[PDB]
From a paper:
Syntenin-1, a member of the PDZ domain-containing scaffold protein family, is involved in diverse physiological processes, such as cell adhesion, protein trafficking, and transcription factor activation. Syntenin-1 is an adaptor-like molecule that contains at least four separate structural domains: An N-terminal domain, two tandem PDZ domains (PDZ1 and PDZ2), and a C-terminal region. The diverse biological functions of syntenin-1 arise from its ability to bind the cytoplasmic domains of numerous physiologically relevant signaling and adhesion molecules, including syndecans, neurexins, and ephrin B12131415. The present study provides clear evidence that syntenin-1 negatively regulates syndecan-4 signaling via binding between syndecan-4 and the syntenin-1 PDZ2 domain.
The crystal structures of syntenin-1 with and without a syndecan-4 cytoplasmic domain peptide (corresponding to the C2 region; 4C2) were determined to be 2.8 and 1.9 Å, respectively. Surprisingly, our analysis of the syntenin-1/4C2 complex revealed that syntenin-1 formed a symmetrical pair of dimers, each of which was anchored by a syndecan-4 dimer. Each syndecan-4 bridged two syntenin-1 dimers, forming a unique dimer-of-dimers topology. Our crystal structure analysis of the syntenin-1/4C2 complex showed that a major interaction between syntenin-1 and syndecan-4 originated from hydrophobic forces between syndecan-4 residues, Y201 and A202, and syntenin-1 residues, H210 and V211. Upon syndecan-4 binding, a structural rearrangement of the PDZ2 domain provided a specific binding pocket for the syndecan-4 cytoplasmic domain. PDZ1 helix-2 (α2) also underwent rearrangement upon syndecan-4 binding. Structurally, the C-terminal region of syntenin-1 was found to form a short α-helix (α5), and residues P273, F277, E278, I280, and I281 of α5 were observed to participate in molecular interactions with residues of PDZ1 and PDZ2, thereby stabilizing the syntenin-1/4C2 complex. Notably, the F275 of one α5 interacted with that of the other subunit. Moreover, the C-terminal region of syntenin-1 induced a large conformational change that triggered inter-dimeric interactions between the α2 helices of the PDZ1 domains with a salt bridge between D174 and K178. The crystal structure of the syntenin-1/4C2 complex revealed a bona fide architecture in which the syndecan-4 dimer bridges the dimer-of-dimers of syntenin-1.
Numbering used by the authors:
A (entry chain A): 112 to 184, 187 to 281
B (entry chain B): 112 to 184, 188 to 281
C (entry chain C), D (entry chain D): 1 to 8
Amino acid sequence: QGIREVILCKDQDGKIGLRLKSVDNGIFVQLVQANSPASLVGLRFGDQVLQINGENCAGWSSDKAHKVLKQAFKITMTIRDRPFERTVTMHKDSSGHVGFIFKSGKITSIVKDSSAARNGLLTDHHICEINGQNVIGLKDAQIADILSTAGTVVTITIMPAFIFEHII
Amino acid sequence: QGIREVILCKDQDGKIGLRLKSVDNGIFVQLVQANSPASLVGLRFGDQVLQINGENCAGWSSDKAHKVLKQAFITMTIRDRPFERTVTMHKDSSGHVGFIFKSGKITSIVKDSSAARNGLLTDHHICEINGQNVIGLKDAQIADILSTAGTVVTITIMPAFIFEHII
Amino acid sequence: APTNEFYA
Amino acid sequence: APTNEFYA
């Protein structure tokens, strides 16, 4: 299972911090606000919502999902975590380098004879986590800091661009 | 890891029967002839070849891959079906999981069905059903694997976009 | 014309 | 123009 059931509580304002999108007759997380019950419950970009308050989200539109959220008395959702992502693990070389070139959080090149080359990292993929930290929405400069500063093993989770583009 | 090394031995014609495609600077299995050594040792559609005899396959062309194969004297490191994900469903009292398909592609999800309760997407291809491969099968015959299955129906699916890219 | 769709 | 890419 990638599946968990989580309960959340609305903020003093009454909102939980989510924006959701319909993709392929499914519902996915398009934005999570920081420090918001949604973020606090572990929701991340690209997470899939199976049921809200027990009601299947299948065939829902983003609008219907939001409305269900606004109108409920106190909230439980069934989530399949990050169904669109893959895990690739790389080890830095003596030079300290794992082998790839990226822009805007999207991998654009693979160095030859690099852990990335050894491990079959692909182009056109966005990097959604490095070593347990979400990088989504983070400036390449901040992403680099996580990367240089990182331990010799590098674990990152990627998503293909076609999907990432749909989610936003 | 989902990574494994597979050792195989070319055949009577020295063929091994595989076809590979280049996706996103990676090499992927596009075809696997049945009852082939490649067939035997388990390669399946959409599996990614990390190296061939220890040489990185990264950035190769589909022809460059094939040429290296047509020139050996065979070991491959592969990463297994990186693009499929798994979904498990349970048949009704009418023995239904609640989706509709054509040419192996999911087309509709039925309300209040196991498929609905589990987040089955439309525009996805079926790759395996309960441990059995099904790419290249006709809809008639995907149907009985469905139809004869037990209560639990675990399938694996691939989004249509990346399925169109490997064929 | 028919749809030739299958259900499960 | 700069490509503004980063490597790791």
